[PDB]
Design a protein around this ligand. Structure first.
Ligand code: DUP
Ligand code: CA
Ligand code: CA
Ligand code: CA
Ligand code: CA
Length: 903
DNA sequence: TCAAGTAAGCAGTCCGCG
DNA sequence: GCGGACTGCTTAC
């Protein structure tokens, strides 16, 4: 096989690389790498290196990396550009792996660990590490084994050995229900004292040195704690053994706001799964406790135990250890589903960066662009400092707030990247400017053609049309991968609906799930076989189809985040290729494109329907348009339709055969108008929405910009077995809205859109009656909590004190001088509840760490003093009244009148 | 919440608004 | 009480 790096670091004048060699063995080397940088020179100087603008450069080979750094400094002092890759390890990888890397994950040691530390006197601060580590479970991907390190003797209690037998038994039998599938994979090692535990751990570590090191909060907790506890007991040198190169760096951070300390272990690539989850998952969670995330992702009931965690070890060591093992596993389970580790390796190897740099699209794109340019003997520009300037983005149409019965949406394929490609937008394809007219002029096709020669954006920029720029070229590469996985994602989806469909008529028999590949649309043969299956088998397949769809969503959306990250980076002053001319050429092109195709659609529809001036486009945001189809449905009748599927078929057909051609034509014109390099404005039908036929549903509604709801029957070719609600921006979709309330608001929306006013009133009233029965966590608001210290004076609320922050202050007072009480953590999320007047807490609300039960120290009084009425009308009623008025209907009947004597 | 971008909504505070 | 100037937070894209 071809070799690949595992990790790379620059330590002084040496590069340290861990790699897999041509024979599949992990190796390590130290290399005194001599970097090259560049500087402009006179033309006569016949060279083979040119800066991206075609200016000739001379390569300067330095004896070592310090010299090269120093040279950059001097070039600055003199005031000349120092060109080339100044991050030397990236240049190293580029020279060392001058090919498309093919990795083998089975050779890569991915280590997943979790530790426990008993602490009775507060949260065990990693930088303090004053408490013994009494448990460590460390899973190794190569061995596929859970290594358990169990402290038996501590100042906080002496315990007996964990029992794998009891671990396996059902919770209902006194066991801990450690899943049978990993029971065999557990290597258990009890220790008589902590020193012996930690020494063995390091020895173990030296032998199976993590390449990728992950887990849950390992970067802000596990790692710095192990590092500092070993340092406290044995000294730095021993602690530095966590680094294959024995080099570590204390490190921090970024604001804004405050700071935190992490330990940088050289030679290791740390991908804290919480951070991976935050970047790649596209969810916003009320809490990021592993318990909460586990239940969310896997639907596993949270691990339960009596007493505080700080007493768990000594009252129930059995469970303590078992839960440390399950913690490690839950993370493995999330990854098997979401597959963020795979995604990270893919991206890091693609770009040829430290794996952990996938967290940075700027670092990622620098590297992609640099390797691409280096291939042609081109030299990259020096990174320069810029002041931060605001700059305009997308256009958002103001909608008339209303109900909307029949809606079809259309959406441009991957807008910003497509604009980059169509226009040929790149640092080195800038051809000049033209005298701009107001945007509206281009929109209405009255402005003079910007250029007969170059490819233009309405922001005034012109671009070469002879050759593709490196930004278009490279962005095209990731766009195509993205597209491939989206195909797999959508096919797994369509397939899922077929299984769901079958689940209406499950056959009575024992059989197996069909061995198929859910990334591809089912063959008619597989379709027949599914109709003949049992519910148990159909359910299983459905599970696998949905797991395929999730795998595809991970692969596709994050490749989209990457390429969209490029368009955005052009607006970030830290990007080597930062340029507001290019950033705004992209966003201004977008504005034009959307309102241009709005004018076109309206025009098309006023002709076909034989009217004038009608606004068929009711809304639009960035790259999408929403068209009112009432009139298109009416033309046929609305009777004349057997069922709901019948008109969806009709609308589908109309979109595909009449509108998209008209839409393509409109965009082809615009391409010519801007004299663009390549027409890539592809706007496909996205959503088909309306109420069930014969129903009183209102189909859809809008309250304003970025706030709407729709009863979707078909989405991007996926024809749902059950209508799916697409709700955007409304409180159902916000993490700050209480769980119970979201659910309730959603049912309310479902009833409005599917059943109508009367079904709506009925539920709203039923909810209002039963509200007070809801569990307190399910009805608490949620907020991030920033700048507490800022508004703390009393500690009472200082001037301008935010509501949630005030709640925190109320909490802090209630638990004053209570060392065990859970502490609200600056920058994290809290649950918030209002409190009735005259409550013992002395304020109008209280707040506590989200994800948790509020301590037993105050729970009872909080429950007694919760203001249900306030809570209710702020979170449920008010927003609901917002929906109903925009929709022009009533959540309460409502004069009869009628009836006979009740009148 | 270290880690590409802007647009824009709603909650809440403070205070005007005769 | 509703709305602006504003801070904080959170979506859509
Ligand atoms: O996080 C984002 C999301 C979108 N955008 C911009 C770029 C994107 O092209 C445009 C429209 O985003 P969509 O959510 O519609 N996805 P996109 O159009 O990129 O591709 P697709 O619709 O095929 O997913 O909005 C960002 O800048 N950042
Ligand atoms: Ca799009
Ligand atoms: Ca899309
Ligand atoms: Ca059947
Ligand atoms: Ca969109």
């Amino acid at each position: 096989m071809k070799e690949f790096y595992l990790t790379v670091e620059q330590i002084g004048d040496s590069i340290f690389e861990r790699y897999i060699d041509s024979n599949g063995r992990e190796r390590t080397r130290e290399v005194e790498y001599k970097p090259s940088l560049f500087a402009h020179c006179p033309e006569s100087q016949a060279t083979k290196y040119f800066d991206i603008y075609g200016k000739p450069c001379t390569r300067k080979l330095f004896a070592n990396m310090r010299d090269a750094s120093q040279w950059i400094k001097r070039m600055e002092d003199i005031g000349l550009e120092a060109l080339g890759m100044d991050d030397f390890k990236l240049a190293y990888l580029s020279d060392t792996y001058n090919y498309e890397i093919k990795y083998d994950h089975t050779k890569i040691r991915v280590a997943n660990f979790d530790i426990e530390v008993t602490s009775p006197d507060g949260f065990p601060e990693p930088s303090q590490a004053k408490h013994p580590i009494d448990a460590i479970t460390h899973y190794d991907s190569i061995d596929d084994r859970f290594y358990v390190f169990d402290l038996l003797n501590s100042p906080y209690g002496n315990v007996e050995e964990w029992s794998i037998e009891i671990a396996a038994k059902l919770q209902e039998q006194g066991g801990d229900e450690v899943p049978s599938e990993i029971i065999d994979k557990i290597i258990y090692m009890p220790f008589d004292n902590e020193k012996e535990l930690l020494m063995e751990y390091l020895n173990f570590w030296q032998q199976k040195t993590p390449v990728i090191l992950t887990g849950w909060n390992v970067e802000s907790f596990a790692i710095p704690y192990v590092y500092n506890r070993i340092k406290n007991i044995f000294g730095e040198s021993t602690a530095k053994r966590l680094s294959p190169h024995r080099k570590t760096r204390v490190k921090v951070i970024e604001n804004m706001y405050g700071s935190r300390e992490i330990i940088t272990l050289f030679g290791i690539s740390v991908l804290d799964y919480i951070d991976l989850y935050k970047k790649f998952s596209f969810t916003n969670q009320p809490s990021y406790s592993l318990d909460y995330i586990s239940e969310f992702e896997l639907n596993v009931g949270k691990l339960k135990y009596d007493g505080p965690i700080s007493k768990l070890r000594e009252s129930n060591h059995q469970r303590y250890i078992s839960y440390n093992i399950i913690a490690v596993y839950r993370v493995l389970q999330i990854d098997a589903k979401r597959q963020f580790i795979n995604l990270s390796l893919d991206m890091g190897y693609y770009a040829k960066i430290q794996i952990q740099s996938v967290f940075s699209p700027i670092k990622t794109w620098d590297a992609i662009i640099f390797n691409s340019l280096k291939e042609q003997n081109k030299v990259i520009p020096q990174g320069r400092s810029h002041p931060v300037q605001p700059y305009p983005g997308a256009f958002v149409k103001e909608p008339i707030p209303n109900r909307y019965k029949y809606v079809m949406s259309f959406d441009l394929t991957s807008l910003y990247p497509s604009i980059i490609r169509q226009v040929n937008i790149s640092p080195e394809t800038i051809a000049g400017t033209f005298k701009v007219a107001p945007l509206h002029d281009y929109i209405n096709a009255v402005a003079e053609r910007p250029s007969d020669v170059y490819s233009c954006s309405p922001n005034g920029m012109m671009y070469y049309k002879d050759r593709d720029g490196v930004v278009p070229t490279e962005i095209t590469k990731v766009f195509n991968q993205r597209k491939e996985h989206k195909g797999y994602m959508l096919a797994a989806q369509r397939n899922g609906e077929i299984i769901k469909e079958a689940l209406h008529n499950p056959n009575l028999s024992v059989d197996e799930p069909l061995d198929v590949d859910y990334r591809f649309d089912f063959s008619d043969e597989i379709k027949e076989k599914i109709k003949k299956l049992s519910a148990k088998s159909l359910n299983e397949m459905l599970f696998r189809a949905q797991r395929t769809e999730v795998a595809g969503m991970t692969a596709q959306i994050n490749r989209k985040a990457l390429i969209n990250g490029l368009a955005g980076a052009l607006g970030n002053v830290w990007f080597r290729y930062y340029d507001l001319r290019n950033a705004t050429a992209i966003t201004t092109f977008g504005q034009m494109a959307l309102q241009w195709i709005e004018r076109k659609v309206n025009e098309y529809l006023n002709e076909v329907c034989g009217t004038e001036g009608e606004a068929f486009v009711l809304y639009g945001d960035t790259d999408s348009i929403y068209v009112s189809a009432d009139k298109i449905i009416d033309k046929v009748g609305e009777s004349k339709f057997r069922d709901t599927n019948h008109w969806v078929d009709f609308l589908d057909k109309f979109a595909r055969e009449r509108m998209e051609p008209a839409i393509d034509r409109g965009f082809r014109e615009m391409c010519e108008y801007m004299n663009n390099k390549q027409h890539l404005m592809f706007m496909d039908r996205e959503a088909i929405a309306g109420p069930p036929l014969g129903s009183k549903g209102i189909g859809g509604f809008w309250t304003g910009k970025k706030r709407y709801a729709l009863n979707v029957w078909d989405m991007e070719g996926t024809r749902y077995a059950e209508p799916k609600l697409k709700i955007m921006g409304l409180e159902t979709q916000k993490s700050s809205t209480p769980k119970a309330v979201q659910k309730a608001l959603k049912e309310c929306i479902r009833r409005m859109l599917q059943e109508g006013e009367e079904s709506l009133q009925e539920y709203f009233k039923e909810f209002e009656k039963e509200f007070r029965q809801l569990n307190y966590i399910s009805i608490a608001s949620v907020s991030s909590a920033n700048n507490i210290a800022k508004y703390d004076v009393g500690g009472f609320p200082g001037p301008k004190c935010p509501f949630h922050i005030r709640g925190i202050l109320t909490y802090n007072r209630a638990i004053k001088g209570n060392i065990d009480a859970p502490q609200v953590v600056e920058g994290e999320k809290v649950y918030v509840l209002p409190l009735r007047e005259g409550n013992p807490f002395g304020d109008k609300c209280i707040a506590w760490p989200s994800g948790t039960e509020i301590t037993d120290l105050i729970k009872d009084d909080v429950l007694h003093w919760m203001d249900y009425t306030v809570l209710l009308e702020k979170t449920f009623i008010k927003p609901l009244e917002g929906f109903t008025s925009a929709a022009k209907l009533d959540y309460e009947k409502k004069a009869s009148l009628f009836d006979m004597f009740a009148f």
